[PDB]
Design a binder for this molecule. Structure first.
Ligand SMILES: Nc1nc2c(ncn2[C@@H]2O[C@H](COP(=O)(O)OP(=O)(O)OP(=O)(O)O)[C@@H](O)[C@H]2O)c(=O)[nH]1
Ligand SMILES: [Mg+2]
Length: 342
């Protein structure tokens, strides 16, 4: 039972408290499908020009957390694959921004590579337009606007990650029952095969839960950083590489922290920067924007060693709760320790 051991159990409670809550989780797909419907409407510049709409990033791998700087807002990443004449990356973003004009949300913000839709309830959407470039699903490019195209295959990365993280029945059933119970909902499933469709699995894998805690640790250590932060797709890639069936949560969290820290250390030893290719599309590097310098990567490695070393000292819990507050956030740790008390 993932709640039997005290350290594994408090980490599980922490992970439950950073998930996309069930009520919002149940709205996410319809939300982005409504965006697609809007940009496909008559008069839109992108009328007839949308090939497909798909989640990328955390939503593609059931890894969504509260967004950096907050405990109660969430960002979802959606790709709009666009067809027709290619007149450059800036014009592609221009078309997407124009198609999203007057969309009834709190605010629409044009970013360097995407258009952001901020929603009143705190679950936001980043819409990245893409151009398909090759037959493989879904090998192509995204705009950066000098303006340039950037190769990517986030679709195949998501599928690759999911293949490495098959649902772990005992773990998933236990953590989902608690996630839903905290939200006032009866999650009633004896087996992962016949979960009631009204209460689907949100949590599926110890590997992903550890990855969510890695991202939370990152979000706390860089909560107010306005510069570049360690990228989640690099962390998600390493989590996929580190995936091991049947591992306990603390053990896996230590393993993933040391995976990234040691990879950084080995590059730094050579005066080189961390390099992490897309397993499904090796010309794409998940390290193309980060790290920019030795200081950046070695700073993050030091944070990761501190996390791994403290969790390992705990395996070998009132002093631990204070240390956890510094690593994962005061309020979320307080809420989790309360649940573990009962
Ligand atoms: N190659 C590359 N892709 C990126 C980079 N940043 C974002 N992406 C792509 O955009 C997707 C969404 O980015 P993120 O929001 O940072 O990833 P995430 O897994 O959703 O992480 P969280 O939002 O922190 O939960 C990623 O899965 C990547 O496909 C980057 O620096 N390099
Ligand atoms: Mg994201």
């Amino acid at each position: 039972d993932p709640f039997a051991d005290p350290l594994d159990a408090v980490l599980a409670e922490l992970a439950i408290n950073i998930q996309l809550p069930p009520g919002l989780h149940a709205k996410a797909v319809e939300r982005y499908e409504a965006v697609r419907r809007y940009i496909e409407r008559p008069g839109s510049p992108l009328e007839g020009r949308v090939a497909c709409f798909y989640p990328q990033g955390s939503m593609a791998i059931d890894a969504t957390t509260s967004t950096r700087g907050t405990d109660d807002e969430y960002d979802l990443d959606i790709v709009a694959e666009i067809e027709g004449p290619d007149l450059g990356p800036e014009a592609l973003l221009d078309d997407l921004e124009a198609a999203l004009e007057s969309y009834p949300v709190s605010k629409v913000v044009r970013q360097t590579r995407c258009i952001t839709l901020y929603y009143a309830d705190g679950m936001h959407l980043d819409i990245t337009p893409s151009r398909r470039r090759a037959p493989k699903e879904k090998e192509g490019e995204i705009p950066h606007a000098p303006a340039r195209y950037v190769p990517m295959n986030s679709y195949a990365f998501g599928k690759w990650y999911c293949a490495r993280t098959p649902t772990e029945e005992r773990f998933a059933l236990a953590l989902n029952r608690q996630l839903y119970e905290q939200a006032g909902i009866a999650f009633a499933a004896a087996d992962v095969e016949d979960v009631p469709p009204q209460t689907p699995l949100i949590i599926k894998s110890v590997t992903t839960v550890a990855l969510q805690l890695i991202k939370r640790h990152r979000n706390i250590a860089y909560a107010t950083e306005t510069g570049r932060i360690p990228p989640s797709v690099m962390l998600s890639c390493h989590a996929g590489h580190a995936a091991r069936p049947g591992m306990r949560l603390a053990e896996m969290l230590i393993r993933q922290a040391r995976w990234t820290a040691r990879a950084i250390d080995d590059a730094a030893k050579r005066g080189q920067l961390l390099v992490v290719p897309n397993p499904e599309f090796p010309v794409e590097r998940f390290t193309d924007r980060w790290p920019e310098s030795q200081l950046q990567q070695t700073t993050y490695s030091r944070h990761l060693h501190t996390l791994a070393n403290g969790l390992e000292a705990a395996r070998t819990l009132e002093d631990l709760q204070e240390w956890l507050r510094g690593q994962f956030g005061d309020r979320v740790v307080t809420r989790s320790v309360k649940a573990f008390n009962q």
